[PDB]
Amino acid sequence: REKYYITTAIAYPNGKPHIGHAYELIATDAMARFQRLNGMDVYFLTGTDEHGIKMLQSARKEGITPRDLADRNTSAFRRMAEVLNSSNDDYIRTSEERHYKASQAIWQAMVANGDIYKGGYAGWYSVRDEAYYGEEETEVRADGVRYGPQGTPVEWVEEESYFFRLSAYQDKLLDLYENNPGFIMPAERRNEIVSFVKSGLKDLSISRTTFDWGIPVPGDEKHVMYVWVDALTNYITALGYPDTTDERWAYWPANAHIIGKDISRFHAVYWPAFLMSAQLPLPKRVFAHGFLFNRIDPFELVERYGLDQLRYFLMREVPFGQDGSYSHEAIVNRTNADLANDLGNLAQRSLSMIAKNCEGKVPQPGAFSEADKAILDQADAALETARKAMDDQALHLALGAIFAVVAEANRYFAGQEPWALRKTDPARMGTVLYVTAEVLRRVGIMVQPFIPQSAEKLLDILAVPADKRQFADVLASPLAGGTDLPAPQPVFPRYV
Ligand SMILES: O=c1cc(NCCCNCc2cc(Cl)cc(Cl)c2)[nH]c2ccccc12
């Protein structure tokens, strides 16, 4: 009955969808699905971040309006979510009116808390470095020109701007990191954030005057909101903010923001400060994943390797939170061994033995031997290990525990030699076949959030009713003898 709210970072649709976008959607989709099967009421959100000057100039470059350009490009990110079999319950675009109103509400709420003032962004700026510097990092040379520490000229620049009093929240954020050690993860991000905040926080510019493609500042519409309040507010726009009576508002606070490593500071410093200012509770965890390197277009990978092969490799091979690598032979070999061979072929060998030798019915199992109990108890244990792993977003440890059972089951099945038992002891052959099919059922229920369509097909050839596929069914709904099984077909074909 318990509510669970999980989000992805909204993607910037200035170019095409890339692997990093698909990686974050897949990882967050698997976490969302995991909690649904674990019995939770899940709301899972993703979307697009469409405002800004770079978007306005690209619309200018193509001869169309910014809103028109946003509609065109987000359509490909909306297509990517569908191709990846994402279970997101909503899709937020910052160009939508509900976000416009949500952003203006949270802005006013921060004005009402005393945290927003109008000022100036004046300082030394190097066009060559694209960076700002304090006066002390500079020196005027024999040129008569002033130079920054990198050896390039700096110029004095001055812009009008609204600010958020970020300096007022330095101590409250450190209190947050002390009272909730799991607020920013993994541990390396946590230490980055703590060291940054502990060194002193300056007030934060949150408005621009150089473009109208954005959300107008209430009461000064020559100014528009910068990315900070715009993008981050998407998390509460999707719940109906500012209408706190919306049925969806009970989902706040978010249980988990899944983000990339590069935007850690925006979600772990700016976002909680905005919320504290606006009198709102804080999300329970922000988790940052790493970056993927080809050691490439997401649509192409899916067509070449298959969706569930790609989902598996990305979540099994990179410890979630770290940088990782992908390559053709690695995807092929890792998916051939685990999916096509270990999982897929174990099902085919065992279940076609049931079709030919047990008349297409789940055999009636006799007494369980010591080996029978070990593989069954290991399968039950993998659920508990997977649960504890997913609580920490350790997706690879969850898949590792599940596929350690698959590998042990192959050794169990080969060690029982049920083909030899067909003549010596048909009743024993049945029990071994029952054990193997029963382990496949528990594994099949458990891999549903990581490879949903493939897991669905596996549970389909085990004749598992659609209402017996929650995680609670691992322990409570074992296969019943005498049940009719459809003719088995391979679930994981080998790569060509
Ligand atoms: O200049 C802008 C650029 C922009 N998108 C750039 C890519 C966003 N970076 C990823 C990101 C994602 C999230 Cl969820 C939150 C933040 Cl703060 C940042 N978004 C903008 C929105 C309003 C006004 C200006 C901009």
**Cis upstream peptide for 253 (omega within 30°):** yes
> What spacing in Å lies between the alpha carbon of 398 and ligand 1's midpoint?
32
Domains identified in the chain, total number: 3
Cβ–ligand 1 contact at 227 (below 6 Å) = yes
CA distance 258 to 261: 10
Map tokens 């199992």 to a residue: 365
- Nearest Cα residue to 166 out of 127, 203, 139, 212: 203
Q: Which helix (H) or strand (E) holds 326?
A: strand 324-326
Check: CB of residue 138 under 8 Å from CB of residue 155.
no
Pick the last residue of a domain from 171, 202, 227: 227
Structure tokens of 347?
A: 């099902």
> What spacing in Å lies between the alpha carbon of 311 and ligand 1's midpoint?
27
Pick the last residue of a domain from 227, 242, 261: 227
Strands 292-294 and 324-326 come out as parallel
Buried b (16+ CB within 10 A) or exposed e, 192-219: bbbeebeeebebbbbbbeeeebbbbbee
> From the alpha carbon of 270, which atom of ligand 1 is closest?
17
Specify the resolution in Å: 2.5
CA-nearest residue, atom 7 of ligand 1: 12
Same domain, 119 and 109: no
CA distance 279 to 273: 10
**Cis upstream peptide for 242 (omega within 30°):** yes
Same domain, 93 and 127: no
Segments of 167-213 assigned E as strands: 184-185, 204-205, 207-208
Cβ–ligand 1 contact at 214 (below 6 Å) = yes
Same domain, 312 and 422: no
CA distance 227 to 224: 10
Axis-axis angle for helices 328-335, 307-317 (nearest 10): 100
Question: 457: which residues sit within 8 A by CB, 6+ positions away?
Answer: 489, 491
Same domain, 93 and 237: yes
Structure tokens of 327?
A: 């390559």
Same domain, 207 and 261: no
CA distance 354 to 440: 13
Give 106's DSSP letter.
Answer: H
Same domain, 187 and 331: no
Substitution candidate for ligand 1 out of 227, 236, 263 with most atoms within 8 A of CB: 227
DSSP assignment of 371-440, as one string?
HHHHHHHHHHHHHHHHHHHHHTT-HHHHHHHHHHHHHHHHHHHHHH-HHHHHHH-HHHHHHHHHHHHHHH
Experimental method: X-ray
Check: CB of residue 236 under 8 Å from CB of residue 94.
no
CATH code for the domain of 221: 2.170.220.10
Same domain, 79 and 167: no
Same domain, 313 and 352: no
Same domain, 23 and 110: yes
Helices (H) and strands (E) in the chain, counts: 20, 18
Check: CB of residue 276 under 8 Å from CB of residue 282.
yes
CA distance 78 to 65: 20
Cβ–ligand 1 contact at 53 (below 6 Å) = yes
> From the alpha carbon of 9, which atom of ligand 1 is closest?
14
3-state secondary structure string, 241-297? CCCCCCHHHHHCCCCEEEEEHHHHHHHHHHHHHHHHHCCCCCCCCEEEECCEEECCC
Pick the last residue of a domain from 304, 326, 348: 326
Cβ–ligand 1 contact at 232 (below 6 Å) = yes
> What spacing in Å lies between the alpha carbon of 49 and ligand 1's midpoint?
6
- Nearest Cα residue to 402 out of 448, 360, 436, 433: 448
Breaks (C-N over 2.5 A) in the chain follow: 295
Buried b (16+ CB within 10 A) or exposed e, 311-335: bbbbbbbbebbeebebeeeebbebb
CA-nearest residue, atom 17 of ligand 1: 228
CA-nearest residue, atom 6 of ligand 1: 12
Its domain, for residue 212, covers 115-227
Partner residues linked to 117 by β-bridges: 163
Cβ–ligand 1 contact at 206 (below 6 Å) = no
Same domain, 163 and 196: yes
Check: CB of residue 462 under 8 Å from CB of residue 437.
yes
Check: CB of residue 364 under 8 Å from CB of residue 434.
yes
3-state secondary structure string, 306-319? CHHHHHHHHHHHCC
Question: 317: which residues sit within 8 A by CB, 6+ positions away?
Answer: 324, 326, 330, 334, 396
DSSP assignment of 407-426, as one string?
HHHHHHHHHH-HHHHHHH-H
Environment class of residue 239 by beta-carbon count within 10 Å: exposed (0-12), middle (13-18) or buried (19+)?
buried
Same domain, 257 and 108: yes
- Nearest Cα residue to 314 out of 299, 297, 295, 292: 292
Q: How many CA atoms lie within 13 A of 132 on its CB side?
A: 6
CA distance 193 to 265: 6
- Nearest Cα residue to 446 out of 475, 421, 424, 425: 475
